[PDB]
Paper text:
However, analyses of the formation of TF complexes on DNA have revealed that many TFs also bind together across the family boundaries, in a DNA-dependent or DNA-facilitated manner. Because the DNA-bound TFs are fixed at particular positions relative to each other, the contact surfaces required for cooperative DNA-facilitated binding are very small, and can evolve rapidly. The structures included two [name] homodimers with two spacings, HOXB13 homodimer and TEAD4–HOXB13, MEIS1–HOXB13 and FOXK1–ELF1 heterodimers.
Recently released versions of RoseTTAFold (RoseTTAFold2NA v.0.2)39 and AlphaFold (AlphaFold v.3.0), which can predict the structures of protein–nucleic acid complexes, performed much better in predicting the overall geometry of TF–TF–DNA complexes.
Author numbering:
A (entry chain A): 231 to 294
B (entry chain E): 230 to 292
Write the structure that this text describes.
Amino acid sequence: APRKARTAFSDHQLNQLERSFERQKYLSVQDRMDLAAALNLTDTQVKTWYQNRRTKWKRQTAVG
Amino acid sequence: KKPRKARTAFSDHQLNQLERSFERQKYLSVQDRMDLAAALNLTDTQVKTWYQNRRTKWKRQTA
DNA sequence: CTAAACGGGCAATTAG
DNA sequence: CTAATTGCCCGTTTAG
């Protein structure tokens, strides 16, 4: 459908999402929702970030 | 809010053909799924669901 | 690059 | 039993 605005994450958001990702490649419902609340992102944003992050990760596992 | 869909009652024939499909191919390509639905006078979704349910059951058998 | 969108699968659940 | 519903993942594609 009409397609929704691309989020531009803040440096603090990107920092803490990279950290979480470093801590954990997958999140529970609970950790996800808490990381969302702590950064003022929606659950979905955080889920799509983590999922997009894995695609890149798998790429770096295929990068050697 | 969204009413639950009626539980499809497949005919003996539809089931036999679904089961024969599954015997050959656990997975259908899109095109194959469309053909088979059309073959059986079913919706693509009816067929996708069946196949999905079927692979579950079959995992319980292989198990 | 990467956020969001897309359809299909998986597991777990719901319910006819 | 099993058809349908849920939330998430994957892999791909779309596009800011």
